[PDB]
Amino acid sequence: GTTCSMSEILLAVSATTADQILEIPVCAGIDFPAGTPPRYIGAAKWLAAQSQMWNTIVFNSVRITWETFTADTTSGYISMAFLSDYMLSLPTGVEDVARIVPSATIALKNRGPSIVMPQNRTAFRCIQAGQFAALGSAADKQMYSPGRFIVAIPKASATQAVGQIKISYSVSYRGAAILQPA
Amino acid sequence: GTTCSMSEILLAVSATTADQILEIPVCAGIDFPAGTPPRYIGAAKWLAAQSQMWNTIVFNSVRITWETFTADTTSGYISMAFLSDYMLSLPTGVEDVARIVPSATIALKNRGPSIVMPQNRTAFRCIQAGQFAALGSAADKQMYSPGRFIVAIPKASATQAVGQIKISYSVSYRGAAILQPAL
Amino acid sequence: GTTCSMSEILLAVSATTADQILEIPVCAGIDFPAGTPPRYIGAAKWLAAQSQMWNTIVFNSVRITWETFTADTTSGYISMAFLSDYMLSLPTGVEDVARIVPSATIALKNRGPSIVMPQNRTAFRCIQAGQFAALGSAADKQMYSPGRFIVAIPKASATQAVGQIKISYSVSYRGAAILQPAL
Amino acid sequence: GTTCSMSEILLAVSATTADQILEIPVCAGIDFPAGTPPRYIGAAKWLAAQSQMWNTIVFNSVRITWETFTADTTSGYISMAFLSDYMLSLPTGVEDVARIVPSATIALKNRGPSIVMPQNRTAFRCIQAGQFAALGSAADKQMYSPGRFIVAIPKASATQAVGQIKISYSVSYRGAAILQPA
Amino acid sequence: GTTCSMSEILLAVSATTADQILEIPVCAGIDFPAGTPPRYIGAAKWLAAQSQMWNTIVFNSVRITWETFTADTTSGYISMAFLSDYMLSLPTGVEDVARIVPSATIALKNRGPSIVMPQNRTAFRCIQAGQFAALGSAADKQMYSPGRFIVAIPKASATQAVGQIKISYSVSYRGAAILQPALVP
Amino acid sequence: GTTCSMSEILLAVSATTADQILEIPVCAGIDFPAGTPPRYIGAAKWLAAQSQMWNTIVFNSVRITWETFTADTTSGYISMAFLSDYMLSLPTGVEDVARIVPSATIALKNRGPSIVMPQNRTAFRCIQAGQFAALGSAADKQMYSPGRFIVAIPKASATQAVGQIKISYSVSYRGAAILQPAL
Amino acid sequence: GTTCSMSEILLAVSATTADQILEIPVCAGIDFPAGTPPRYIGAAKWLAAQSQMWNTIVFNSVRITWETFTADTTSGYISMAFLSDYMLSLPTGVEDVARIVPSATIALKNRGPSIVMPQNRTAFRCIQAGQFAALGSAADKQMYSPGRFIVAIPKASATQAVGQIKISYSVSYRGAAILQPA
Amino acid sequence: GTTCSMSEILLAVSATTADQILEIPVCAGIDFPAGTPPRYIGAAKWLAAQSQMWNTIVFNSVRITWETFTADTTSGYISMAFLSDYMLSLPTGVEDVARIVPSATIALKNRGPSIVMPQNRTAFRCIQAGQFAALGSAADKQMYSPGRFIVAIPKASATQAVGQIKISYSVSYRGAAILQPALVP
Amino acid sequence: GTTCSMSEILLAVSATTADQILEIPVCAGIDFPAGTPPRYIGAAKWLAAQSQMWNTIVFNSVRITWETFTADTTSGYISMAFLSDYMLSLPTGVEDVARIVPSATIALKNRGPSIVMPQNRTAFRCIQAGQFAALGSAADKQMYSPGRFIVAIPKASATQAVGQIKISYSVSYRGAAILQPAL
Amino acid sequence: GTTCSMSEILLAVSATTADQILEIPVCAGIDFPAGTPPRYIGAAKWLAAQSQMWNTIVFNSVRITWETFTADTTSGYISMAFLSDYMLSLPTGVEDVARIVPSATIALKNRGPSIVMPQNRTAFRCIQAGQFAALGSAADKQMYSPGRFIVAIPKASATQAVGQIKISYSVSYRGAAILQPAL
């Protein structure tokens, strides 16, 4: 068992005429959009790979951050938040993602404070994304994940790139084994 | 980055009328016999999968162990050893695997001490088995691996199962990313 | 609530022309092969009985050991290992059980070090073997068990007895109640 | 070997036109009325199950308590006591259970002090209730049990429920094994 | 996240010619008898409401108590107990609820000691009663609850009121959010 | 009263086409197979003799060990374990002796760790083997013995010698007297 | 190896018209009069049995004592003494047992000081009484015993019981084994 | 529970033309020769009575002593000893009672050292003499007694009184209860 | 007077259709099977030679070990033990050598713990093997030796080599003289 | 001058109908069987090569280990030992290699303790195997070597592979020079 820390890109946000309501579950092995039908998005490639090696992972810390490709002219906001429960629905409406125990609206081109997950040190049996997408009930999903990490942006007049979002973490492994998934 | 520890099966040894000279490289991502042509054997499935997620792995510890399916009647020995260099040839002759800085001949059905790798804490950029099999020079291979883990058994009159060998380890990851391998 | 400790037999290993890939889940109440269709094997009779009395069990320690009925003539190996996760498949191939975070190949007639489960002190709601066999998803099974305890031996030319495997443990109960299991 | 502690129900007392003279032996594995012919009553289900797992049990502590389902109108008393010897007869007569080294008459609907067993730290080889009912001489039974726990109530004009009695304990196991009883 | 403490009524017990075998699961959000078909009973209205606001609840303490509306003339007993496991069946027979690790038979009109849950400080993701009634396996239900709280009384010749039972607790919340529940099959 | 310590042979194990399920009670005076009908086996001759002299014996320590006459060719396992209770049945099935609080499967020709009895310092009124075989209920037998010491080996194709098992102990006597046993 | 201590009867003395000159060797395993022809007398049954279990015995202490069944009317003396050498003859004549490095004449019905063996902590390979009676030379016998313990009483007019003599000891064993004697 | 200490007579020894081989078990409640058929002898009346009151007795100490009614003219010896095990036979032959871990031959009219039981502090469930005589196996009897206390004297030409033997003890009770004994087959 | 330490071979064990019950006395000067008629076996050649030089030898330590020539196929056990007394008979039956204060059944091809003699620092007048074989009573033999070192293996279907046993020791001499032995 | 440590194979043991009595001298430069006529066996290739570079070598530590290729069925023992003197003869008879100051009989398929050379820190002028085979008297050979490392196994019914033996060591060099050996 060994410890690890890295800063890595999660997703490349894109403004679009439709509203964007997005959620990224924090499994031991991420790499969504697993299908099928496809679900969730974002993928920290390093983590799934390194964690496909062990057997039990504790994350000491994790954070999500925003970075700006945009010119000052653009108008728009960007909400980020962190549900800790699966039984609840994904909120509909950015007006409603605006309310959370932890939330931010950094947008669109500003420094801005980094969201940080509330502490939760408990062992989490690692699984793969296909495994995780295959799961049915939320009661199942709560076995493997601290909770979905939700991000949302309102519609804009025309599609355009705007900038990456960037996870950072410290995580600690135990128990080495390399076998085929059930 | 997160730490991990597990006990896992590596291979299922089989006695055979030919001599058995076997080597298992210890990459960040194992799962041999990668081809082609196929090379090496053994596969800790959990490790390649968990480690295909990150980007840089340090193994704090690793051990190899023997376990017995055999009845007392069987005769035979089983040598295990750990070369730390690729420039050297695979020894030919079990009589010659008998000599090593670290070695054992537990065989064939006894408790027996577990081989353990000498300490080596340094960062190792993770790669896949197809990647690793594709490598040419040994000078390349030393970038990614601590060193091949060699095991050997002498010939017997008739083929038969005899028992699994079992790796254990503590390993520590950093840097998360999930991308397609270069060719 | 009371504490307890005992050394007890788990299974009587038998060499056979087919390969043997075996797994024994460590429930609060064991006594497999529960059916039906039948699954798993081994049975510490004392534990299921004593633990059918309480309601919540913590195991401070547990170990698995090998003992030899065989004559020296027999050839064969015996791998033992301990997966801590249900989502993963049972490895196929003794060559592949040879790799594990914790593993051994003591075989076939030697003292040999005892496998020991990595520490895991957390409360585990007790259930019965029929209950446990009835469970569907692995995500369910992880509620009640630390993890399956896998053992494997390679094929041999003719069937024969070879020796018992022997669990030992210290375990600690709380909460007394004696009721009929739910269906 | 592990330690344990729980609070659990033992029996549900019922007033009846006949006198009630009841005894509950404290084995390592309880779950009476074992037969046959049936003997004793009460059953802490958790304990027999948890203790069917080990091989040698020491109870650091144990207590018996009374709880009231009854309305104030009801009249009646309830004696509780703890013989430590099997060679002696079950007393006949509640008037005679009234005398003991340790005794109480809490009844029928009052707080009331909890009976507590005098200390006795010595190893006790666990057995099952069918095993225990099968035993003949008292000299045999003293091998496995600290002593019978007696409870008694006088007759009333009409049958009715009145309330549970509730054991509590701290107990400590050693030696793990799971085999078929002789 | 904030802490809270209250004393509140749970149910109003009623003697009846049938035997009464009752169980009240201790969810983060109670308010049974959720259906359908209806299951469980009792409802601490304050708790479900206050806890429908947060996201993760730890109960530091909880107790169940008996209070008497009855005249002295009435005869009957009342057992109270606390299973910590769902895999086990509801005991049948008050004679059998009489045996428990923790139990009492206060009945019917006496002071009587209060039952108290054994300590269990661990985080419990809050859910609603319809959610909870929708759950299938016991293995699911153990995710959300410490364990069912069982109460039982023997039959009597004629139906009548007898008195309330009364929960008390200290509980501690974290994580604020207010969203629509997911639809469990 | 005097103290004593010795290493001594207990039994000479023999592979056989039938399964071998064996138990050796640890009385103050051993020397089984007492009859009749005959029961139990093994006999530390020195101990019964020295202990037929006193009146009350405490054993501070005791261990059981395996030693190998066999050639490497033989296949087979050998389980050893230690029940502390008489009320329980002798397990049937070596697969089931494999599970115990304390157990080992050293077999068949390996160093292997020695089984050791869990500590139990309490006075034990000495009796003879005929006395002990005469006893009826288990509740009687628990007066005189810490608990039966069970050993088991699986069947093999043909009968053959394989090696002695070897008890060792430290024991401490009190109270000297030499009288005829009661019937 | 374990330690032990007990108080135990050795012999039941009997007055007789012949003179009584008696000796009791202190082997690791006593239980004389071993034959044949029979030799020596007295037997601490507990010791031979407990010591037939081990392999090497050291006696830290040992004492011999007198106890009185007799009425005051009886006349007679009783000498007790402890030779440490086998090469010497058994003294003939109670007048001659009267002289010793350690001796007493407690007789016949008095409290009286207990004889005690001079310290001798050295390992003594245990043997049985038949073994010991079989030995020829004294040089052989000195391998196994500290030395014979002699007791003697003068003749009286008529035979009668008079009282037991009573050994006490602390002894310490090592090395456990149970095999047939050569 | 209370402590106690007394000096009391056990038996009145009598010389006789037959050999005398006698044993007195040390139960919590003595008062032999219980029958039937009658067994053992001696009786400390005070102890059975005081101990029929409690429930669990530990004896801290106990001793046996000899006292002389005889004139100096009498010839004879008197052996006293203390077996701690029931599995063993009563020795036959005073010559054989002469050998013991603890023994004495005070006889017949002398001061003489008092025999004393080796220490053994462990709880002993009290029973009555009829109870104890009813017991079958020695393995049963070892539950209740430290061990039989044996005394023996050789034959003499004519029967005569010679003197009492006298127990002394310190003993400590716990647990008070007074109930009818169970009927052992 | 000088001190010394060496590791040396004692005997070369051979499986055989008859049972093997063997004992090796530990004299100051070994080199059995002295005759005649021949008795005992094994011979540490170095020790008799070096010790034929002095006059009084104390052994601070001594150990006996097992080493495996056999293939895994062979079945059989091997008991080793150490009687400290000559008055006792050689046990008959490997089942009976299985019981000892110190014992092991390592067999047949396993690491296995080394038997070690319990401490005994006392001066031992050196003699030769012919001298020692000439001795009659056991009471004589206890003058010169700590005690016989017994080893035993059960019968097998066909004769074959299986491996050496290997003594190790630290010993300390005093008093130098070189004279002809008495008859 | 630099330090070094490695685990390496020495030889591949083979059961054979003849008895096997083998010795491997521990020179600064090994790689036997040097001739002619050929003598000794085993070869740690890495060591001779690395040590052909310097001029004076001290070995801080060295160990020999056994590893099992055999099935449990095989019967046989395997003795390992370490003479420190050349003046003495190679023992004949595995029964006689059984006695040594340091010895083991792990065989044939068991964990088993590793033999270890007694400490001996003194400078040893390096030579080559042809050089060493050319030497005549033992008095010459003691200049360059700590002492021969002997291994032996008893005969078996049919030839077969059984397993490697495996040296491990820490060694420390001084003085660099690369010249042609003297004849």
Residues of chain A in contact with residue B54, where contact means CB-CB under 8 angstroms, are 4, 6, 46-51
Is B114 an interface residue toward F (CB < 8 Å)? no
The token duo for D82 is: 């703890």
**What are phi and psi for residue J49, nearest 5 degrees?**
-75, -50
Provide the b/e sequence for G30-51 (b: ≥16 CB within 10 Å): bbbbbeeeeebbbbbbbbbbbb
Cβ neighbours of residue C155 under 8 Å, at least 6 residues apart?
Answer: B160, B161, C16, C17, C18, C19, C20
Kindly determine whether residue F182 and residue H138, on different chains, have CB atoms separated by under 8 Å.
yes
What type of residue is D42? Answer: G
The closest alpha carbon to C101, from B116, B9, B172, belongs to B9
Cα–Cα distance, J85 to E170 (Å, whole number): 81
Cα–Cα distance, A166 to C97 (Å, whole number): 39
Cα–Cα distance, C160 to G44 (Å, whole number): 53
The closest alpha carbon to J170, from J2, J1, J6, belongs to J6
Cβ neighbours of residue A10 under 8 Å, at least 6 residues apart?
Answer: A24, A42, A43, A44, A64, A164, A165, A166, A167
Residues of chain F in contact with residue B71, where contact means CB-CB under 8 angstroms, are 74-77, 108, 156
- Three-state secondary structure call for residue A56: strand
CB-CB contact of C76 with B69 (8 Å): yes
Q: Give the torsion through C-alpha atoms of A136, A141, A147, A150, to 10 deg.
A: -20
Cα–Cα distance, E151 to E21 (Å, whole number): 6
Q: What Rg do the C-alpha atoms of chain A give, in angstroms?
A: 17
CB-CB contact of E77 with D14 (8 Å): yes
Is H179 an interface residue toward D (CB < 8 Å)? yes
CB-CB contact of J169 with J2 (8 Å): no
Kindly determine whether residue G6 and residue F1, on different chains, have CB atoms separated by under 8 Å.
yes
Q: Report DSSP letters for I9-71, one per residue.
A: EEEEEEE-SS-EEEEE---SS----BTTTTB-----HHHHHHHTS-SEEEEEEEEE-B-B---
CATH class for the region spanning H1-185: mainly beta
Cα–Cα distance, J164 to B98 (Å, whole number): 4
Surface-to-core class of residue G121, CB atoms within 10 Å of its CB (0-12 exposed, 13-18 middle, 19+ buried): exposed
> Count of H helices and E strands in chain J?
4, 8
The token duo for I162 is: 């299986």
Verify D-I touch: 3 or more CB pairs within 8 A.
no
CB-CB contact of E92 with D7 (8 Å): no
Cα–Cα distance, H110 to H97 (Å, whole number): 20
Structure letter (DSSP) for residue E104: E
The closest alpha carbon to H151, from H132, H165, H170, belongs to H165
What type of residue is A163? Answer: G
Cα–Cα distance, F93 to C42 (Å, whole number): 10
Q: Which stretches within chain B are classed as H helix?
A: 45-50, 94-97, 129-134, 138-141
Q: How many CA atoms lie within 13 A of C121 on its CB side?
A: 7
Cβ neighbours of residue E120 under 8 Å, at least 6 residues apart?
Answer: E59, E146
> Could you state, in order of their start, the residue ranges of all structural domains in chain A?
1-182
Cα–Cα distance, J71 to B153 (Å, whole number): 10
The closest alpha carbon to A22, from A9, A35, A33, belongs to A33
D152 bridge partner residues: D21, D79
Structure letter (DSSP) for residue A145: -
Cβ neighbours of residue G100 under 8 Å, at least 6 residues apart?
Answer: G81, G82, G83
Considering the domain G1-182 in this protein, what is its CATH number? 2.60.120.20
Cα–Cα distance, E127 to E144 (Å, whole number): 8
What subunits make at least 3 CB pairs under 8 angstroms with C?
Answer: A, B, D, E, F, I, J
Task: Identify which of C144, C176, C182 has the shortest CB distance to residue E89.
Answer: C182
3-state secondary structure chain H: CCEEEEEEEEEEEEECCCCEEEEECCCCCCCCCECCCCECCCCCHHHHHHHCCCCEEEEEEEEECECCCCECCCCCEEEEECCCCCCECCCCCHHHHCEEEEEECECCCCCCCCEECCCCCCCECCCCHHHHHHCCCHHHHCCCCCCCEEEEECCCCCCEEEEEEEEEEEEEEECCCCCCECCCC
Kindly determine whether residue D182 and residue F138, on different chains, have CB atoms separated by under 8 Å.
yes
CB-CB contact of J182 with J65 (8 Å): no
Residues of chain G in contact with residue I83, where contact means CB-CB under 8 angstroms, are 55, 177, 179
Task: Identify which of G7, G109, G169 has the shortest CB distance to residue H112.
Answer: G109
- Three-state secondary structure call for residue B74: strand
CB-CB contact of E14 with E139 (8 Å): no
Q: How many CA atoms lie within 13 A of A126 on its CB side?
A: 41
CB-CB contact of J28 with J51 (8 Å): yes
Kindly determine whether residue C44 and residue D175, on different chains, have CB atoms separated by under 8 Å.
no
Q: How many CA atoms lie within 13 A of D25 on its CB side?
A: 27
CB-CB contact of D109 with D72 (8 Å): yes
Pairing label, strands F115-116, F20-24: unpaired
Cα–Cα distance, H67 to G72 (Å, whole number): 10
Q: How was this structure determined?
A: cryo-EM
Q: Report DSSP letters for C43-90, one per residue.
A: --HHHHHHEEE-SEEEEEEEEE-B-B---SBB---BEEE----SSBPP
What subunits make at least 3 CB pairs under 8 angstroms with G?
Answer: F, H, I
User: How many Cβ atoms sit within 10 Å of the Cβ of residue I176?
Assistant: 11
Cα–Cα distance, G40 to F135 (Å, whole number): 36
Residues of chain D in contact with residue C55, where contact means CB-CB under 8 angstroms, are 6, 8, 45-46, 49-50
Residues of chain B in contact with residue F73, where contact means CB-CB under 8 angstroms, are 73-75
Kindly determine whether residue G12 and residue H97, on different chains, have CB atoms separated by under 8 Å.
yes
Pairing label, strands I56-64, I115-116: antiparallel
Task: Identify which of C71, C106, C110 has the shortest CB distance to residue I74.
Answer: C71
Count of residues making up chain G? 182
- Three-state secondary structure call for residue J123: coil
Cα–Cα distance, F176 to G176 (Å, whole number): 18
The closest alpha carbon to D123, from C5, B116, B5, J44, belongs to C5
Chosen from D6, D9, D79 to mutate, greatest number of chain E CBs within 10 A? D9
Q: Which stretches within A71-165 are classed as H helix?
A: 94-97, 129-134, 138-141
Fold of B1-183: Jelly Rolls (2.60.120)
Cβ neighbours of residue G38 under 8 Å, at least 6 residues apart?
Answer: none
J23 bridge partner residues: J150
CB-CB contact of F100 with C63 (8 Å): no
Is I83 an interface residue toward G (CB < 8 Å)? yes
Chain C, window 35-64: residues with a beta carbon less than 8 angstroms from a chain B beta carbon: none
- Three-state secondary structure call for residue J2: coil
- Three-state secondary structure call for residue D96: helix
- Which residue from B minimizes the CA distance to I73? B74
From residue D154, give the alpha-carbon distance in Å to each of D20, D111, F39.
6, 20, 53
Q: Give the torsion through C-alpha atoms of E83, E89, E94, E98, to 10 deg.
A: -40
- The alpha carbon of residue I85 and the mean position of all alpha carbons in its chain are separated, in whole angstroms, by 14
The token duo for G58 is: 């050291």
Q: Which strand (E) or helix (H) includes residue G153?
A: strand G149-153
The token duo for E53 is: 């606001």
Å between G139 CA and nearest CA of chain H: 27
- Which residue from H minimizes the CA distance to D137? H184
CB-CB contact of D153 with D77 (8 Å): yes
**What are phi and psi for residue A77, nearest 5 degrees?**
-115, 165
CB-CB contact of F146 with I145 (8 Å): no
Task: Find the largest Cα–Cα distance for chain G.
Answer: 52
Is the backbone peptide bond immediately before D108 cis, with ω within 30 degrees of 0? yes
User: How many Cβ atoms sit within 10 Å of the Cβ of residue I132?
Assistant: 22
**What are phi and psi for residue D131, nearest 5 degrees?**
-60, -50
Q: Which strand (E) or helix (H) includes residue I176?
A: none
Kindly determine whether residue I75 and residue C76, on different chains, have CB atoms separated by under 8 Å.
no
The closest alpha carbon to J82, from J60, J57, J99, J59, belongs to J99
Chosen from E51, E128, E179, E183 to mutate, greatest number of chain A CBs within 10 A? E179
Cα–Cα distance, C78 to J68 (Å, whole number): 12
Cα–Cα distance, I45 to A87 (Å, whole number): 82
Q: Give the torsion through C-alpha atoms of D146, D148, D149, D155, to 10 deg.
A: -170
Kindly determine whether residue F88 and residue D143, on different chains, have CB atoms separated by under 8 Å.
no
Is I85 an interface residue toward G (CB < 8 Å)? yes
Is H158 an interface residue toward G (CB < 8 Å)? no
Is C86 an interface residue toward A (CB < 8 Å)? yes
What type of residue is F81? Answer: A
Cα–Cα distance, G74 to G159 (Å, whole number): 12
Provide the b/e sequence for G139-151 (b: ≥16 CB within 10 Å): ebbebbbbbbbbb
User: How many Cβ atoms sit within 10 Å of the Cβ of residue G166?
Assistant: 32
CB-CB contact of C28 with C124 (8 Å): yes
The token duo for J178 is: 């690369």
Q: At how many Å resolution was this determined? A: 3.6
